[PDB]
Structure formats: structure tokens, C-alpha cells
Write a protein that binds this DNA or RNA. Structure first.
Ligand SMILES: [Mg+2]
Ligand SMILES: [Mg+2]
Ligand SMILES: [Mg+2]
Ligand SMILES: [Mg+2]
Ligand code: NA
Lengths: 124, 220, 119, 142
RNA sequence: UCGAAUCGCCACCUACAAGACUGGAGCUUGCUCGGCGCCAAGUAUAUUCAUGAUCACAAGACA
RNA sequence: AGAAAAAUCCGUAAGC
RNA sequence: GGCCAGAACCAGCCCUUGCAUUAUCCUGUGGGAAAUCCGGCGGGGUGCAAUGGUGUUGGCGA
RNA sequence: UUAGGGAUAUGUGGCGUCAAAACUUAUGGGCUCAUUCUCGAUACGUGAAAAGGGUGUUGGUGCACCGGCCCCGAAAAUGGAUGACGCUUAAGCCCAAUUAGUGAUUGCCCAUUAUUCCUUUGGUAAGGGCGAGAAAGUGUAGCCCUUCCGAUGUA
């Protein structure tokens, strides 16, 4: 006669990060490398585990353009989009990472927003 | 106050009530500058934060020293037209917000968004009381930041002595709130004890190897 | 509170010898002490800072005196040693063991619900 | 031994046949399956749920999208699964595919049942993996 | 219109105070005697999952 | 999407 | 479509104990219970070495 | 100390926020409380003298002196400046480390510099040749291929 809420929906399968900015000094920034902070990763030994993984940055646009499985699975068509990258090396003593996006830079409109870090691309 | 168009859109869509992820920080017995620096960095990293009990922050030194500092700040005004000059806010929540604003990059849209992501109160208001547990910042607490022999000041007393007519109002509201919460927590003691007893008794009825695993991992 | 004195048993907080138990054998100064423990292989005589120790409630008064006092058995019996061993067990664990712990906890929660409803 | 030989392999030692893997990507992300073999010429792995435990059929998966755990089950099955079973010409399942799946699943379930801790391993295969708020996969071992 | 980004929830947290302070005694004054949640409503005897064909925004939701 | 709001009736985070 | 993606392999590049000295030393056998300390006798841890290629699997394109 | 671009590593200067780096490191030692321009706190350079006192120490001996930090000496004209906020179990001052008495090696951040890779251009240039391709050639859409070094600049 006592019930609880049980979470039996689709699983997550990635870690939640946040863009922090780009690499920079006192003179300005270089936009081709980005800094990402991941939750519960707070040491350089921890951030070493994630080198080679793949990161996403999901957002949305204004109109429906083409996606990966446009023809098969027409249930995927949406205004949602994504921009993939990869982790290259740690950035300090406290568990930050340097990521490199494929063929361009991540836009600066993403600076305070959420980044997905997946477990697979280098499994082990 | 929502617009009639916003209300109509909500009614037509039919979605349920929504609340974003907000962290509520109990700022009692925290060091003002260290708390401000930590909160500013988190706001820039993209968090929504609400701070309560801003009138019980701490500063180091004597109240006379800190009051003289504030009066020196208050002495600055644009001589040619004071209605343009610096505006000196007297409430503790405004003092905290100004410290954070000076630690942010305020003349940029990014810094403006960060500053608007923050809400500050005195005491704990009714719309915040029942939203979940409050947090602390362990690297900015007085009992680990100050040596015990040295004097310190409470922000509420200094702000009362430079202005701030609402100290007694806040005191009365806080006393009433604590009384109500104490009554509620004195209730439910039987329910808490009943749940603890049920947890203790279920061990005798669950399977033995499960009990063994629990004992091995320390949840016994 | 527990005092710092000769023969007092302490636990190490951080460092390569953390969560280990030793005996204070000499007070060098207000900040440093010398610690040894014949039972542990890594605890030969060395210098420890007083910011890195936690005094316990046992004070022997070396191997013969320690064995006679039998403070090691009492420390093994108390609840702090249990918590430390449980922390090591949780640290060294596999996916299968995490699954076993999860099902054990779910079983206990279910039976607690049933008992509460019965009462 | 020869680099271009069909029997060549490089796959790491944790993905030995009979191991239990966590699927990290695709339609069956989060599920746990059993590694059956590796297709030749350093090819993909082959996994089975078995079905009726988690719903994963015989499928091809690259070893980079799987966490191979230390829990295994001893398997001695016939393994008549070449790459032709997966290649195809240029709710709907072929008779050959359905029969092969039936035979393999029968053998696998018999082996799991025979193994000690078998009930626990069946529940383990039924369970689902997810990343929760507050846990660090980089600190665990599997 | 509108498809969109966000991915823990709770009448057990959502009361309070102190760190030269922490359960109760003794004198010998330093010695002695959060809870749940993660795939059978619950740890067993069961049961549908493919062809969405080897990654792709989770083709799924607002427990 | 964040209220110095609220949590037969009326009156009691109680007995009501 | 070499248009966009994934994995694999070659080449290259970046990374990732020994022997010397062991002595103001170690160890048994008048002063301040014991220890710290000072004369007699006996036994014994730091300088070197160890981008370029060659196919394969999907998506979009009738 | 400077051709057009990647990657790796540094110099000067730094690692509480602004602002990249110790998510405010250390399992290092001492000292200091400063009430209206004023406790300190990046040289060049932009804050001060005689004299006098508080807290920590040092010669002497049977009280005197003599240094560290802080206070007094220290008074101007628009409201204002360790860059701002702030900091005192420092985010100050003088020393010293690199994950800490556990045992060989480099905590990390940032250049138009260093190393390396790709491309251009010029030589007091150096070699080779004569299925689509080759001209005995200063200078081109350079006859073809390989190799090494330099590249800023007012009159
Ligand atoms: Mg110059
Ligand atoms: Mg920073
Ligand atoms: Mg020139
Ligand atoms: Mg000219
Ligand atoms: Na400065």
C-alpha cells in the first residue's frame, strides 16, 4: 500500500559537461581549442581517463534541415542539431580538458551551456 | 506577472508546472569576499543561484573599522549632478549583489546574463522555504577561515548603523518562521521513528545472503 | 577530546600511509611526532606532522606493551575500522558486485515497506 | 600470423569470447550481452543477449562501443556464424536467421544455467546500466 | 502556429545551534566505564523484444 | 519557465 | 558523390633495476630510575647507467 | 627581435574573481591588527626624516643597547583609487618545496622566441636527368626532379 517512483525510462549513457571558454592569455583568445569542465572530474589523473573520447554540444535552429537518417527513420527530422569533437589533453591540475571540434570552432553562443561527453569512442 | 498570451499558450499546450534547477545557499556565517568569488565563478559557469540569510554574513575586523570603510565609500558622489553619481545601497542583499557585480565582467552581455541569474534575500522567504535542502560553501565558512581570538562583524548590524530601516522586521519574521518549522519538526517524530524501526526490522525478513552482502559493504 | 601523549594510538589522514594506525613513540616538537607500528609492514619509524593525525581512545604504556594492551583488537572491533574497511571494499569492486549490492538494498527497502504497511 | 591472413587479430584481451559486455551506443545502449566470437580479418564482435533476457538478438558490434567486464560465463557452443549470415543481397526475420538464433540461445541459456552463480548472472543480464547524478566511471574497475 | 536546447525525486532532506564544540556518567581533570531510485511490486520457477541490419540529438520522456 | 504568494467551507502545517 | 562519418593496418614522429660510494654511520659490552649526552673495548643514501599511405563498413544522393 | 600556417616546449610575468593557470596546493617554518588620504601588497617610478612606544629576539649582568613588524611624528583645495572588488587559520611580509621523512626523473598557465612538420619566395646557391609525362634552359602557366640556407624596416 506504499508506492515509490521508480526511474525505468531510457538511460543516459554520457557525462554532463559545460563549455568554459577558449584557450587564452592576457592578450586574447585562440578559438580553435575549447575548455570543457566535466562533473565529478576534479584531478589531472581523472581527466587523463577521458582523452580520446567524443563530445557533442546539442542545440537547435529555426528550420528543419537534413539529418543523418533523413530517409529511413523520418521520425528523426527536427530543428535539433549537433557539432561533434574529441578530447585531446588535460588543462591544469583540477580536471579540465582541451577539446577540438571537427573542421571548425564551436560558436561562442555556447560558452555557458551543456556539453555531452560520451564513454565509447575509445572504449578502454 | 505572466501575460495573457503566455497564460493562453500554457493552457493550450497543457504541459505541467516547470521549475528549473536552482541552488539555494544559506549564507549564514560565511566570509563575504570568499563567498562572492565562489558564487561569481559558478554564475559564469552557468548556474542559477539563490542566496538567503544575507544579513548574517561576516567580515573580519571590528564593526567600527568596517563602518568607517562604508562611510568612506558613501562620501563619493558626482558633484555636478548627484542624481547621476554612484548609488549607495544599504541593505545586506544589495551589498552582496554589488560585491558579486564587481567580481563579474558587467559591461558585456555574458556578464549581464550571469548577474541576472542571481537572486538574494534577507532571511528565508515563504516561496523558498519549501523547495528542498539548502547548501553551504565549506571553503568559505568562518569557523575554518578566521582565527577564533580575533574580532569580526555581522553585516546586519553595520548596515543598520549606516541605514537600512528593516532590521526589526526581518528579526520578527525570522523568529516566526523558526517557530513554525520547530512545531512542524516536533510533529512527524513518530513517523520518523516508525520508518527507522521498520528499516531495522526488515533485516530479519530479507534473505540471508542479501544481509551478508549488506554487512560486507557496511550498509548493515 | 583525546590528548597527544606517548603511547597514544593515532590514525593517518592523508598521504601514502592514509587510513593506517600507529603509535606515538616520541614528541619531537609542537608540530611533529615520531610514529611506528610493528604490526604493519609500511609503518616503520618515521616523522609525521600533527596536521596529519587523528588521536584515538587507546594509549599503550614496545611490541610487548602493545600486545599486552590489545588495543589493536579493540580498534578492529569499533565502528571506525568497519567504515574504513567498507570504504576499501567499495573502492575495489566490480560491476557484478555493484549489482549485488543494488539488489540487496532494493530487497531491504521492499521488506521495510511491507513491514511499515503491516504495522 | 600473416598480416593479411583471415585469422589475424588485434582485439584486446578483455574481449575474450564468453565475457559480458555493456553496450554503449546504438539501439540497445545500456543493455548487457555476451560476447560470442570475433569475425575474421580483424572484424566486429558478435553479441547475444540472449533474447528473453534483455531483447538483444544476434548482432554485430565494434569493440570500441563496448565495455568488457571481468565477469564471464564458460561457453561451449557450435558457433556456425560466418559473415555471410550477416551479409545480405541488394518483425520480418528469415527462417535461417530465426533458426540459428533459436539454437544459439538454447545453448547459451543451458550454459548459463549450468554455471554456478547462474541465477545471479541471469539477473545481471536482465539489469540495465545508466549514468546517474553523482558517480564517477573514471574511478571504477569493471 | 510549435518542431525544437535542458535529462533525479520525495508528508523520512525541505527545523535549529556550536567547532576551545559532538551520547551519558564518574571524578582522578585527562583518564576510566537524509530516504528512495538504476528494468519480475522483488531475489526466484518466470516472460514480448530482431530487418531500426556496426557510431550518428534518446526514433524516447517529462518516475 | 525563478512570485519577500498559496499549500462544504469557516475557524484550526494540531486535535477539527 | 572520394559528399559526410566510423573502425582497422603499415611507416614515422610526440609521449611512459645494475655498479660505485655507503663509517661524523650501525650494533653489543660517567652522568642524568629509563632515555638524551660524554670517554674505554670488541664485531659490521647519492653520483653514474639499464603527417603520409592501403583497402573496409554505414548515411545522403534514383 | 618580425615570410603564410599547425603541433610541442619555454622567457619575462604569474596561478581568489574580473582573467588562462594551486575547482583558494602542501601530509613547510616564522612574523603582523593597522578609528575618516594611510596596515601591507609587481623593480625602473611616483610616500618621509630626527625623536618616541606595543608584540615577538639578541649581545652583554649582578639593568643598559639593538635589530624585525606595527603605531605616533605625517596639514590642502571637483568625488576616487595596491588597476577594481575584496583579503587577516591572508588573497600581506622574509625564506623554502612540488604532491611530500615513501625511496632517482619535469606542479601548470600564457609569445610573431626555440624544436619540428607543410606551403611560398630569393640565393656568392648545391646535385641529378634530357598510363601521363621531358624545351641544353637568366627572367613565364617557371624544361623536369631532389637538397640546404635566409626572409621585418623610415630617408
Ligand atoms: Mg624593442
Ligand atoms: Mg580561471
Ligand atoms: Mg624587405
Ligand atoms: Mg620608401
Ligand atoms: Na595588480
Amino acid at each position: 500500500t506504499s508506492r515509490v517512483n521508480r526511474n525505468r525510462k531510457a538511460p543516459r549513457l554520457y557525462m554532463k559537461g559545460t563549455l568554459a571558454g577558449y584557450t587564452r592569455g592576457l592578450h586574447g583568445q585562440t578559438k580553435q581549442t575549447a575548455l570543457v569542465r566535466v562533473e565529478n572530474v576534479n584531478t589531472r589523473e581523472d581527466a587523463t581517463w577521458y582523452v580520446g573520447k567524443r563530445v557533442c554540444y546539442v542545440y537547435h535552429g529555426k528550420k528543419v534541415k537534413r539529418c543523418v537518417r533523413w530517409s529511413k527513420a523520418p521520425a528523426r527530422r527536427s530543428t535539433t542539431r549537433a557539432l561533434w569533437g574529441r578530447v585531446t589533453r588535460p588543462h591544469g591540475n583540477a580536471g579540465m580538458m582541451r577539446v577540438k571540434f571537427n573542421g571548425a570552432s564551436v560558436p561562442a553562443s555556447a560558452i555557458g551551456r551543456r556539453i555531452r561527453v560520451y564513454l565509447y569512442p575509445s572504449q578502454i | 506577472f505572466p501575460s495573457r498570451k503566455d497564460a493562453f499558450r500554457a493552457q493550450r499546450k497543457g504541459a505541467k508546472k516547470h521549475r528549473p534547477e536552482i541552488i539555494v545557499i544559506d549564507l549564514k556565517d560565511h566570509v563575504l569576499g570568499r563567498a562572492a568569488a565562489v558564487v561569481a565563478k559558478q554564475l559564469l559557469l552557468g548556474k542559477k543561484i539563490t542566496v538567503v540569510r544575507c544579513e548574517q554574513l561576516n567580515i573580519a575586523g571590528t564593526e567600527i573599522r568596517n563602518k568607517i570603510k562604508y562611510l568612506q565609500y558613501l562620501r563619493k558622489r558626482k558633484l555636478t549632478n548627484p542624481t547621476k553619481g554612484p548609488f549607495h545601497h544599504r541593505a545586506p542583499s544589495d551589498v552582496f549583489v554589488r560585491t558579486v557585480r564587481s567580481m563579474l565582467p558587467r559591461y558585456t552581455k555574458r556578464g549581464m546574463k550571469a548577474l541576472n541569474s542571481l537572486v538574494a534575500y534577507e532571511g528565508i522567504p515563504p516561496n523558498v522555504v519549501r523547495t528542498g535542502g539548502r547548501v553551504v560553501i565549506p571553503r568559505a565558512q568562518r569557523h575554518v577561515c578566521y582565527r577564533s581570538e580575533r574580532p569580526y562583524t555581522v553585516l546586519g548590524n553595520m548596515c543598520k548603523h549606516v541605514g537600512w530601516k528593516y532590521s526589526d522586521v526581518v528579526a520578527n519574521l525570522e523568529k516566526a518562521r523558526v517557530e513554525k518549522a520547530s512545531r512542524h519538526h516536533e510533529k512527524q517524530a513518530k513517523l520518523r521513528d516508525a520508518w527507522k524501526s521498520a528499516r531495522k526490522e526488515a533485516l530479519a525478513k530479507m534473505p540471508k545472503h542479501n544481509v551478508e552482502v549488506l554487512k560486507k559493504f557496511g550498509y548493515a | 577530546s583525546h590528548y597527544i601523549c606517548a603511547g597514544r594510538l593515532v590514525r593517518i589522514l592523508r598521504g601514502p600511509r592514509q587510513d593506517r594506525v600507529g603509535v606515538i613513540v616520541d614528541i619531537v616538537d609542537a608540530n611533529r611526532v615520531l610514529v611506528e607500528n610493528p604490526e604493519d609492514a609500511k609503518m616503520w619509524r618515521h616523522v609525521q606532522n600533527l596536521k596529519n593525525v587523528e588521536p584515538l581512545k587507546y594509549c599503550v604504556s614496545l611490541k610487548d606493551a602493545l600486545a599486552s594492551s590489545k588495543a589493536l583488537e579493540k580498534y578492529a572491533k569499533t565502528r571506525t575500522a568497519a567504515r574504513v574497511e567498507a570504504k576499501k571494499a567499495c573502492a575495489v569492486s566490480t560491476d557484478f558486485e555493484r549489482y549485488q549490492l543494488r539488489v540487496a538494498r532494493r530487497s531491504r527497502a521492499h521488506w521495510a515497506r511491507k513491514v511499515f504497511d503491516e504495522k | 600470423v600473416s598480416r593479411k591472413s583471415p585469422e589475424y587479430t588485434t582485439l584486446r584481451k578483455s574481449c575474450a569470447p564468453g565475457a559480458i559486455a555493456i553496450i554503449l551506443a546504438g539501439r540497445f545502449r545500456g543493455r548487457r550481452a555476451v560476447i560470442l566470437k570475433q569475425l575474421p580479418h580483424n572484424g566486429p564482435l558478435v553479441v547475444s543477449g540472449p533474447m528473453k533476457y534483455n531483447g538483444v538478438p544476434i548482432r554485430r558490434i565494434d569493440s570500441r562501443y563496448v565495455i568488457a567486464t571481468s565477469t564471464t560465463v564458460d561457453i561451449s557452443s557450435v558457433d556456425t556464424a560466418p559473415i555471410t549470415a550477416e551479409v545480405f543481397q541488394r518483425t520480418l526475420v528469415s527462417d535461417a536467421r530465426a533458426q540459428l538464433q533459436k539454437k544459439i540461445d538454447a545453448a547459451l541459456i543451458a550454459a548459463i544455467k549450468k554455471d554456478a552463480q547462474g541465477k545471479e548472472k541471469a539477473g545481471y543480464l536482465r539489469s540495465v546500466f545508466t549514468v546517474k547524478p553523482g558517480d564517477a566511471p573514471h574511478r571504477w574497475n569493471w
